[PDB]
Design a protein around this ligand. Structure first.
Ligand SMILES: O=c1ccn([C@@H]2O[C@H](COP(=O)(O)OP(=O)(O)O)[C@@H](O)[C@H]2O)c(=O)[nH]1
Ligand SMILES: [Mg+2]
Ligand SMILES: [Mn+2]
Length: 238
């Protein structure tokens, strides 16, 4: 396949079917979808089950159980790293169990990378609807090329060439950072690694949507956004 979509899942039974359906109905259909379930409860696994009949889905379930194992590593970074090692696509993109892709997301992002060989990482705008009907609507624009993506751009709004993963692994030893000190902001920490070598190019369209309507005590102190952002400003790549 041209694209590898990597989705992480953990106990969001009321949302995961809408997320998976949004990917399977994409107008660009040449992808493989990894569904990396982190050993969710029965209700969630039963919602996911029928989607395993789609021949593009590659379903993996971890054996993770209990607070020690849940807090040893940033779990979605570990699962994304596992999927990357099995990925066959030229372009890599990410999805979560509570985010929805707009129907033309893959077509438009693939076209941006096919059309501009000089771009290696692209990001789109993102929208969040607050329900209570809609009480609030938030948009995260994609209006400029940026060398400082941490906490400005979400996990679910990006697509990049597989070759980006090579450069990152050469300097850092892994793709995503599995250290549990970056649990709250794992996507930002991966973007911080990518931003040592590549800027993020904007695609000014809202292509992903979010609907908002013992574990925490066993994590190490959480590093923050300001730390990553200041570190890149200091790095001075743009
Ligand atoms: O033990 C866990 C907890 C979460 N996740 C996944 O991590 C991603 C980010 O999680 P969450 O939505 O809880 O984070 P937030 O929205 O706070 O960034 C989601 O795909 C979850 O399914 C996971 O794989 N294992
Ligand atoms: Mg987040
Ligand atoms: Mn979430």
């Amino acid at each position: 396949p041209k694209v590898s979509v990597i989705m992480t899942s953990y106990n969001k039974s009321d949302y995961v079917a809408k997320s998976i359906s949004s990917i399977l109905s994409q107008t660009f259909s040449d992808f493989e979808l990894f569904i990396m379930d982190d050993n969710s409860n029965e209700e969630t696994l039963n919602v996911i089950r029928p989607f395993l009949n789609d021949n593009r889905v590659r379903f993996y379930q971890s054996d993770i159980s209990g607070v020690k194992e849940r807090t040893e590593k940033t779990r979605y970074a570990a699962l994304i790293n596992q999927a990357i090692e099995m990925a066959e696509g030229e372009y890599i993109t990410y999805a979560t169990d509570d985010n929805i892709y707009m129907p033309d997301r893959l077509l438009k992002m693939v076209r941006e990378l096919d059309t501009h060989p000089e771009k290696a990482v692209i990001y789109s705008a993102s929208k969040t609807y607050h329900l209570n009907d809609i009480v609030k609507e938030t948009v995260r624009p994609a209006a400029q090329v940026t060398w400082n993506a941490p906490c400005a751009i979400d996990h679910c709004s990006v697509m990049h060439r597989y070759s980006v993963l090579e450069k990152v692994k050469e300097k850092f030893g892994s793709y995503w950072d599995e250290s549990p000190a970056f649990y709250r902001i794992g996507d930002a920490r991966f973007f911080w690694r990518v931003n040592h070598f590549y800027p993020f190019y904007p695609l000014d369209e809202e292509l992903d949507l979010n609907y908002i309507t013992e574990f925490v005590r066993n994590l190490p102190p959480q590093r923050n956004c300001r730390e990553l952002r200041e570190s890149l400003k200091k790095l001075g790549m743009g």
